[PDB]
């Protein structure tokens, strides 16, 4: 599938990201490439992570937990399940604290100017959030109307099974085809979503959603293919 | 607040020996993250406290292998394995689990050296002082063990008892000796109004009082 992924959002300028799985560990820096080629397509791969920096000669761990990678053929995305984090803010201790957030959404972006000029495409894939990679994403794009819409199903948390309301395809800053819209729960707005189109023939979609729940804003990683 | 109880105000130890100083918290200092937020410091007189132990057991950089720390969660112990003269001071335990950060009362580490004799020195008032109007006859009874000593002053033979100050040293960090200074202060004329001045040191090591004098 996608053979490499450049880590950008996932590891900032003066950080090192230590990934470990099945006894092996490798360290990455910003701009470094992740060998997604070795990973299974259409599944979440999990690694132990430690995000680190160096302060006046000593190595400091900022956060640790589980690093997740979802691989498709022309797109892939990463996410972080924090388990422990530095509370540099108040009690300067490493505190047990769980948060889930998307890292990088990468791949071969489809140009807005090189999209199919017509026809209707259906994408099927995964929606994954905190402790739950079992969600199903269904998304439809009408290339004549240049509009897309979809839905998220099969997530354990009921408020995360939402509609991805109809939205226009637009060019982003790099003229990549992107769809940014509203998230609905039982037909009422409860958040926002964004999906990029990937592959030379718009084979795939990948992106994320942010849903407001009674427990706060929750992030959902999204990836589907024709 | 969390209270640090350092029961013993002092703790006797002989050189080459093993010492233990105990601390006690009013709450388990072990965090849910597994780390026990306890410090140990040493403060020598006229100096800032120096760090010895962090995270209850870890030895701060540049601290001799001699030192170590252990603890339960509410009971902590600082341990010096082979006690040197330079360990003499006050040991404070500190918690930094929650605000406010609180310290233990302190535990003075007293060294038990073998009885030593003073080296009494007498000095007449400074040529500089006399022109300023005064006269301070100073006496130094240095490097003696133990602290129990008494000094007398003889002016031409008659006992001098009023206008004399005695300053005592903290146990010496090189030989675990004690020292003190006696200072008989008079006016320019009052001092020149007499000829012989002497120092009478009385210590356990000598039944026969220790004397040091000068004549003009």
Numbering used by the authors:
A (entry chain A): 30 to 255
B (entry chain L): 1 to 216
What does the paper say about this structure?
The X-ray crystal structure of the complex between fHbp and the Fab fragment of JAR5 was solved by molecular replacement at 2.98 Å resolution. The epitope of fHbp recognized by JAR5 is composed of two loops comprising residues 84–91 and 115–123, which are localized on the more polar side of the fHbp N-terminal domain. The interface formed by fHbp and Fab JAR5 reveals notable shape complementarities, with the two epitope loops of fHbp trapping the heavy-chain complementarity-determining regions (HCDR) 1, 2, and 3 of JAR5. Epitope residues 119–123 are located near the interface between chains H and L and make interactions with both chains, while six residues of fHbp make direct polar interactions only with the heavy chain of JAR5 (JAR5-H). In addition, while loop 84–91 is located on the periphery of the epitope-paratope interface, loop 115–123 is more centrally located within the interface, and it reaches into a groove of the Fab JAR5 to become partially sandwiched between heavy and light chains. In agreement with thesestructural observations, the SPR binding data confirm that the contribution of loop 84–91 to binding is smaller than for loop 115–123; the fHbp-JAR5 interaction seems mainly driven by residues on loop 115–123 since the mutants Gln115Ala, Gly121Ala, Gly121Arg, Lys122Ala, Lys122Ser, all strongly reduce or abolish binding. A model of the ternary complex fHbp:FabJAR5:Fab12C1 was generated by structural superpositions, showing how the physical separation of the JAR5 and 12C1 epitopes allows their simultaneously binding to the same fHbp molecule.
Factor H-binding protein (fHbp) is a surface-exposed meningococcal lipoprotein that binds human complement factor H (fH) and is one of the recombinant protein components of Bexsero® and Trumenba®, two recently licensed vaccines against serogroup B meningococcus. Anti-fHbp antibodies can elicit complement-mediated bactericidal activity and inhibit the binding of fH to the bacterial surface. In the present study, we investigated the structural basis underlying the synergy between JAR5 and 12C1, two murine IgG2b mAbs. Here we report the crystal structure of the complex between the Fab fragment of mAb JAR5 and fHbp variant 1.1 (also referred to as peptide ID 1), and present a model of the ternary complex of fHbp bound to mAbs JAR5 and 12C1.
